[PDB]
Design a protein around this motif. Structure first.
Motif, mmCIF file in Angstrom:
data_model
loop_
_atom_site.group_PDB
_atom_site.id
_atom_site.type_symbol
_atom_site.label_atom_id
_atom_site.label_comp_id
_atom_site.label_asym_id
_atom_site.label_seq_id
_atom_site.Cartn_x
_atom_site.Cartn_y
_atom_site.Cartn_z
ATOM 1 N N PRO A 113 -8.733 14.444 1.748
ATOM 2 C CA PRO A 113 -8.955 13.577 0.579
ATOM 3 C C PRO A 113 -9.388 14.320 -0.675
ATOM 4 C CG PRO A 113 -9.981 12.638 2.541
ATOM 5 C CD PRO A 113 -9.558 14.025 2.905
ATOM 6 N N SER A 114 -9.528 15.638 -0.610
ATOM 7 C CA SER A 114 -9.771 16.384 -1.836
ATOM 8 C C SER A 114 -8.481 16.684 -2.608
ATOM 9 C CB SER A 114 -10.513 17.691 -1.528
ATOM 10 O OG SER A 114 -9.673 18.618 -0.869
ATOM 11 N N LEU A 126 -9.043 3.863 -1.578
ATOM 12 C CA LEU A 126 -8.894 4.736 -0.414
ATOM 13 C C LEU A 126 -9.761 5.985 -0.538
ATOM 14 C CD1 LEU A 126 -7.514 5.891 2.152
ATOM 15 C CD2 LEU A 126 -5.671 6.676 0.659
ATOM 16 N N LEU A 127 -9.748 6.632 -1.711
ATOM 17 C CA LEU A 127 -10.587 7.818 -1.883
ATOM 18 C C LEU A 127 -12.073 7.461 -1.842
ATOM 19 C CD1 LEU A 127 -8.542 9.828 -4.545
ATOM 20 C CD2 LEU A 127 -8.593 10.040 -2.029
ATOM 21 N N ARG A 128 -12.464 6.375 -2.515
ATOM 22 C CA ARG A 128 -13.855 5.927 -2.454
ATOM 23 C C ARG A 128 -14.298 5.745 -1.011
ATOM 24 N NH1 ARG A 128 -16.004 0.742 -1.717
ATOM 25 N NH2 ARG A 128 -18.144 0.494 -2.512
ATOM 26 N N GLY A 146 -20.613 -0.939 2.639
ATOM 27 C CA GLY A 146 -19.714 -0.727 3.754
ATOM 28 C C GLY A 146 -18.321 -1.315 3.594
ATOM 29 N N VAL A 147 -18.124 -2.224 2.648
ATOM 30 C CA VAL A 147 -16.811 -2.824 2.441
ATOM 31 C C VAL A 147 -15.917 -1.809 1.737
ATOM 32 C CG1 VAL A 147 -15.553 -4.636 1.246
ATOM 33 C CG2 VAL A 147 -17.630 -5.207 2.438
ATOM 34 N N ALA A 148 -14.702 -1.635 2.247
ATOM 35 C CA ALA A 148 -13.743 -0.707 1.656
ATOM 36 C C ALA A 148 -12.732 -1.395 0.752
ATOM 37 C CB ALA A 148 -13.005 0.049 2.763
ATOM 38 N N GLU A 149 -12.258 -2.570 1.157
ATOM 39 C CA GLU A 149 -11.167 -3.262 0.487
ATOM 40 C C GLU A 149 -11.047 -4.649 1.097
ATOM 41 O OE1 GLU A 149 -6.998 -1.848 1.083
ATOM 42 O OE2 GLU A 149 -7.267 -1.271 -1.021
ATOM 43 N N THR A 150 -10.704 -5.643 0.276
ATOM 44 C CA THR A 150 -10.559 -6.996 0.790
ATOM 45 C C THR A 150 -9.359 -7.664 0.136
ATOM 46 O OG1 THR A 150 -11.927 -8.158 -0.842
ATOM 47 C CG2 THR A 150 -13.097 -7.175 1.055
ATOM 48 N N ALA A 151 -8.929 -8.763 0.750
ATOM 49 C CA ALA A 151 -7.929 -9.664 0.187
ATOM 50 C C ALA A 151 -8.304 -11.089 0.558
ATOM 51 C CB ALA A 151 -6.530 -9.355 0.726
ATOM 52 N N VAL A 152 -8.255 -12.014 -0.406
ATOM 53 C CA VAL A 152 -8.560 -13.413 -0.148
ATOM 54 C C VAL A 152 -7.312 -14.253 -0.377
ATOM 55 C CG1 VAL A 152 -11.001 -13.059 -0.746
ATOM 56 C CG2 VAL A 152 -9.406 -13.960 -2.493
#
Ligand SMILES: CCOP(=O)(O)OC[C@H]1O[C@@H](n2cnc3c(N)ncnc32)[C@H](O)[C@@H]1O
Ligand SMILES: CCOP(=O)(O)OC[C@H]1O[C@@H](n2cnc3c(N)ncnc32)[C@H](O)[C@@H]1O
Ligand SMILES: CCOP(=O)(O)OC[C@H]1O[C@@H](n2cnc3c(N)ncnc32)[C@H](O)[C@@H]1O
Lengths: 595, 666, 664
Positions: B353-354, B377-379, B557-563
């Motif tokens: 990831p670098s 993704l990097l975060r 802790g949350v990386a990504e979401t979709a509602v």
């Protein structure tokens, strides 16, 4: 019996002042700039002022009659659709380009430059999707609905060569023209409507195309929506094809001398010739004649009642009026439908400023009685034009008295398919008219009279012989399609150094030209140019016919092979209507024992 | 106070406005911005570009920005109603001349492309001279196959530098290129090849991405079994590994190009001649058509002004040329401006990831442009991979493709930019050709998650979808529309103009309809908050996806979401959330049930009670397109029990993830 | 103390320098030269055309010399290394417009072509008007066959004037013509028709040359049985004798052109669109583009031949050769002057033919090959001495080194010591003349091309070091430093062959393939092909020096020298010698003549150059271009007659059998 320009042509009564005026000397002052050895200047300026060019030209003119290599503005590039549509759309999109006077008067409407341009671009995109390339021929078999203009101009937009076939032609006549030009695409309609009757165009097309092996695509305009056959793959609906396409299409950049259209035309000998016009000179000639012969001004509403299937419709319905950016009429009906008031009902409804028709239409309306014209306004009209044939003195006066109320100029316009635009005509703000005289040659036209028994020019006035032109003019036809030998033989070989119109003419003591009529076997019946040899050939093919002779109304004298007489006249009349078209039936067929 | 709220952020609004930083003030030896230093300087220029007296500015920019063969006369005509938009119609030009020849004539050895290969040690610079010579060779090959002006050519190339030569070879001869993401399925490739009716296809033997092989030629062979019109395939030898080759039909790019001269004339194209078709994916593949001059001008101006590009810049758009972002901001915009552009062959996490930041420091990139999905993704991978880089060559960081959550915006700003770069959130679509709303980085103070103000030539409004009427003033929310054409608008959908009119021009007659919900806040900043189709209506509260997704990622802790919404008897619709957690998050110490309750409480605090998710699904990843869009329609249909009406998902980023969602929802 | 010597001459070097004569001084009613009167005036202008500040001159000449539809912006770009040479790239133009239309518009009755028919009574003048009309009719025919811009069209026409109409009709529509010498075998024609992938071929029923019939249509019929892409053949009815005609495929030129108008628009061509492919001997299709080639041929015609508007230029070559492309059709007609199309041979009906022609038409310049000059010299002076010939001002020689003995014959009898002689060095691949005297400026040396033309910067490289030899009195291989406007742009569908042949031997340069020397005065001497050098005991010998020495002996007409492997000297010189017809082999026995020839070479060059063996032959193997095929002679001497290849289309194949017999 001489008629000076009336008040409507003197700038009086608030009318537009004439472009050329007010007298004969004012016409000569301008005309002298357009002919002779110092005339390039005028032609170069008018070409650049009248048309929008992509590339400028360097050379004004080159070439000549002898070898048929006439050239005008050869290095310039332009597009006829850009000049007839885009440039006006950019300036005033909502201006009416076409007054569509439908067969039924209440279905008429105005078509804006924007709407016409959009429909032209969609059709052009349809044609490109069929693989039509610059220089391909495309046949058009359409009646007088406004989309015919979109069809012509879509071909011009992509540099295709349209070949319009008069909607009054038979299946065999359509087939012959489709085959001669070798087109792979035909544009037509499901049916036409004229004078309250239906033309089964798609039916005629399917019969013609049974023997047209090159046609691959047919685009069918849904004029009536009645059930017509459609061949899967080959045949597509105009509206369904155009709906897939963008409403803009770029313009192909055309050389001045790229062919613009083929128009099949009857000669004295042989089958109809595909008369070919190129782009810049033809467009220039039609625009200039429209402006000057009809004294058209920017807000005019020009009503040419002719048909786009003939050169009059090409030049003075579509190309001339639209190049000038004015409003032009597309008249789907007849002069007597629903009633013989129609022409004048039309003039008053739209406030038409000019009217252009054949002497025949005028004579027919005069037959139907003055009740139909005496009680209209018609004050919108300034110029009344006549074309196609000699206008009788009685007709000229009736035209002036009733249609014009003795306040209109009558322009008697002489020209031919091969000349592209009007050749001899009065300019209506300058020339005093004699009933029945074409008067004086148009700009660029230097005409002479030649004794046929000698081949030499009859100089001076009060002479008579054959009419010829001394020098090429911008709109002269450039060839006969794939038959240049016929072009040279017909027009350039009889009098080397000159162009041979095929008409007799005389120049009276005042210098007025009087068009006597064809000196060959071409006849003008109701404005249509018909060959007596074609009628004889049509009649000869009938089972039982042994020898025919057709002489100019058309009259046929027939003798039968030894294997009711009035009932036989009808079967031969139908034979001519089948080979050529209904409009071509002879006025009388006489059965004789020997010729 | 205000009806419209910023996207949820842990930073208070009063501390959340970011003036252009010193690197964008002409300090420290950086170029002075083209537009600056404040909002008034943006408005002063922008006002010249819209309205009844804006032809003058557009005619001048067109003539100053591009090299023309023939000048135009008319600046613009046509409109939305019938789809007859025209710009500069009488002019002629060539996109390849403007992207290659004119720069080659001035500085042939200048680097056109930084080719960052999948493996870092194979990267190299490609000069304008080399790029032009290879473009001309390919153009001569295409002419030898009988390709003519206006013919379509399909391109199925991965992110090697020759993809630019293939695009520009088509443009050079006036062929219409149609580029398909390398890795798309045989079925998705077939549909696009057949739709554009091309007779020639350009591809590789194999592509390499993230250390994986893309079996491009094998996929092509499968596709062309159902593509009867394709007669010639040109195959670039990217890996040299054995692939099948059909006698006659298939030829090697190197062998064909070696026979041809290294110069080819440019076809003189009308402004409105089609330049390319670009297929996007909720029905049949939609072939978005762009013409030549307006598209090229829009990409050149946006690249110059939105990224403040100056002559020596090294512009790093990390996207794929199968996406409009790669068309406009890898190839056409940067090369039209004559600068250096990056062609990135790998992924943001290969080998590690670098990668992005190794690349920035190796090549001293001056701008970087990527998608929120890459940023999230990097975060997710943690700060060790970025914190110990230099990155000071950068001045502007761009984000494109979906709303950027303020949490992700701050990460980008803090670690990629070290609080010294301007962040440009660039809103646009394939159909707009070029960036539509974005900060000008020398002028605009940014808010996290806001696109801010419309670009030159863009006059946008908000319509209330419940009334169909424009909402006047500030602090309004509704659906985004444009009032007038702009030069780079798509001209049609290929051979389906009716779909073009019905999709963009019919919903709000008189306007262009983007399909996105939007708000204009009390300062006049625009906020693009998600697709209209994705709005969730809970008891009359209309919730945008961006606002709820931005609330959820505030949780540790949350990386990504979709509602997505699902029908509800009591509330009309109910919010359902799909949540991905960082890999290290301990799902035993916090069971799925207690996490959901913390998430719901957080959404209620920052949005309101109505926005709390009715149900929450923990998933390892979300269905996404290759470009990074989250496929909420797929999730919405699965929650609705319509998992059998999903459509062709063979070519999404990872089709296996659909089966996981179907399983977790059951 | 000079290491470089002039080609052997019988005239002392001190008496062997020829200033521009009065006819090239503007005296005697002749036009003043464009460049004059001395070397300084040449180099002053030439300096403007090479180096870093030469764009201005080239841009100006391009705009002054040609009529453009669109102006260019960029003067030049690209280079040798990758073969991406560009000149005037954004400009557009048409070669037929520049060679026909613009002159027709100025003076349509001016003669474009003096058509000198095989039978003198049938010669006539063809106006620009007539040539333009014919060209346009043919262009319209080609368009009716579906010929599009960029399509190839093969041309298999003899030297009747309509061949010019066929070339320019292709150029008018942007097709790429590929002309093949009429009389080439069916096999040679097939290979060239197939390589260019043309769908249309233009030919004659028959050709007439030297009173002999060339069965062009019969050969075409045999070739096309193996040319599957050819769909249409246009057949010019030159002789009217019965020939087969295939229904559908074959059509008569007169019958097709009679259907078409006598004007056709010009296709607007980019400067770098290909203008033509010209095969040399696999056959190599040399490709030239449009603007640079046309500009190069127009400038060289004007300056090397000092052409003025009323001149009557007589290039006596065949349009199957680049010399006919550049100096029969494109150069002279681009300049709007009168050009000769010569259908006959130099000796039909008699060897007076050239001079009968010159006096009949009052030719002002004559341009031919050394093989033709030596042929006329072989036939003796009665055929030339009693003509007038004073209309001539410039006599040109092209195609091979001109031995000083033949130079002097040209100068004395054709020129009557009153014309400038221009020895013009160039190649198919250079497009236009590369090194030549400017006749109003340069004092000539017999056998020397003298100085480079505008835009040509040439050097000498030592082939052992690869290094440029700077300065004067140096010898090695000729190279060019920078591209010039008319350089060939590729080899058709074989760019790798183009780069490997011309651009890779000496990177950074164009490699001509000829040996050259620059003498102490700076004069360039082209001494023969690099492949023809002979190495005897460490002495490197060029063909031109040894052949020039041999022809100094009385009665020698023409010779060729080749190397034969030798165990003790590496190689030995072998010579093939043709004698004048009246030379008595009974008074001077062959053995004694051959000894005399070797002694003469030993005295003038040295013993290492003296032929070890001399063969007397009736003629030498030659191409149709006039080149002596020394490779064929070398392979025969080496016992390699099996590896000769197909020679069915060289000037006289029977000569190879004589040579084989004599060497055996
Ligand atoms: C315009 C339609 O042209 P065309 O269908 O080619 O017919 C052209 C032929 O019609 C005749 N003609 C046309 N105008 C007149 C007129 N004003 N007076 C007398 N006769 C005329 C004439 O015989 C000509 O030669
Ligand atoms: C340029 C890629 O164009 P496309 O792949 O056609 O996607 C176009 C669709 O992506 C979304 N979108 C792209 N950028 C943003 C952004 N900055 N903020 C919010 N939403 C965005 C939006 O829904 C749009 O309508
Ligand atoms: C123009 C014909 O071009 P080509 O048929 O392609 O022959 C090109 C080859 O002829 C030779 N050559 C031509 N002119 C001369 C000359 N004046 N002096 C010496 N050698 C010459 C040389 O070997 C060159 O390389």
């Amino acid at each position: 019996d001489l008629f000076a320009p009336p008040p409507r042509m003197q700038g009086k009564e608030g009318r537009p002042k004439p472009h050329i005026g007010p007298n004969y000397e004012s016409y000569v002052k301008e005309w002298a700039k357009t002919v002779g050895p110092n005339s390039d200047e005028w032609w170069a300026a008018k070409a650049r002022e009248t048309l929008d060019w992509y590339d400028d030209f360097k050379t004004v003119r080159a070439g000549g009659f002898e070898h048929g290599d006439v050239q005008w503005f050869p290095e310039g590039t332009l597009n006829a659709a850009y000049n007839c549509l885009d440039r006006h759309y950019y300036k005033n999109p909502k201006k009416t380009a076409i007054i569509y006077e439908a067969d039924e008067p209440s279905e008429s409407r105005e078509v804006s430059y924007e709407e016409l341009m959009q429909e032209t671009c969609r059709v052009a995109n349809v044609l490109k999707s069929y693989g039509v390339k610059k220089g391909d021929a495309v046949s058009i078999y359409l009646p007088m609905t406004w989309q015919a203009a979109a069809a012509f101009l879509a071909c011009a937009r992509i540099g295709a060569i349209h070949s319009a076939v008069f909607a009054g032609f038979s299946a065999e006549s359509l087939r012959d023209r489709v085959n001669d030009c070798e087109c792979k695409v035909l544009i037509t309609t499901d049916e036409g409507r004229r004078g309250g009757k239906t033309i089964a165009t798609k039916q005629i097309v399917d019969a013609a195309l049974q023997q047209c092996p090159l046609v691959e695509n047919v685009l069918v305009l849904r004029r009536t929506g009645n059930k017509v056959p459609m061949t899967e793959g080959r045949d597509k609906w105009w509206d369904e094809e155009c709906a897939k396409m963008p409403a803009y299409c770029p313009c192909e950049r055309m050389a001045s001398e790229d062919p613009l259209f083929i128009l099949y035309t009857s000669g004295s000998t042989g089958k109809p010739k595909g008369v070919v016009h190129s782009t810049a000179g033809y467009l220039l000639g039609t625009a200039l004649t429209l402006k000057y012969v009809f004294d058209a001004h920017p807000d005019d509403r020009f009503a040419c009642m002719a048909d786009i299937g003939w050169i009059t419709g090409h030049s003075y319905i579509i190309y001339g009026p639209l190049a000038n950016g004015i409003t032009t009429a597309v008249f789907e009906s007849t002069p007597v439908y629903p009633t013989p008031s129609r022409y004048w009902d039309f003039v008053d409804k739209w406030k038409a400023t000019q009217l252009y028709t054949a002497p025949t239409a005028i004579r027919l309306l005069r037959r139907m009685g003055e009740d139909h014209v005496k009680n209209h306004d018609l004050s919108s009209l300034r110029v009344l034009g006549s074309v196609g044939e000699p206008i009788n003195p009685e007709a000229w006066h009736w035209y002036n008295d009733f249609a014009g109320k003795n306040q209109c100029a009558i322009v008697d316009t002489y020209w031919m398919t091969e000349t592209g635009s009007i050749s001899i005509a009065p300019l209506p703000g300058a020339i005093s008219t004699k009933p029945g005289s074409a008067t004086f040659p148009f700009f660029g036209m230097d005409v002479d009279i030649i004794d046929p028994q000698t081949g030499q020019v009859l100089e001076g006035n009060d002479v008579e012989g054959v009419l010829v032109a001394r020098r090429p003019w911008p709109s002269i036809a450039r060839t006969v399609y794939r038959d240049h030998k016929r072009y040279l033989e017909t027009y350039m070989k009889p009098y080397p150094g000159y162009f041979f119109f095929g008409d007799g003419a005389a120049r009276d003591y005042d210098g007025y030209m009087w068009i006597k009529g064809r000196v060959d076997d071409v006849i003008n019946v109701s404005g249509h140019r018909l060959s007596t040899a074609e009628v004889e050939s049509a009649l000869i093919l009938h089972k039982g016919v042994a020898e025919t002779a057709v002489v100019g109304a058309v009259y046929a004298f027939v003798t039968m092979k030894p294997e009711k007489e009035a009932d036989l006249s009808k079967e031969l009349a139908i034979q001519v209507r089948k080979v050529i078209g209904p409009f071509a039936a002879p006025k009388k067929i006489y059965l004789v024992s020997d010729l």
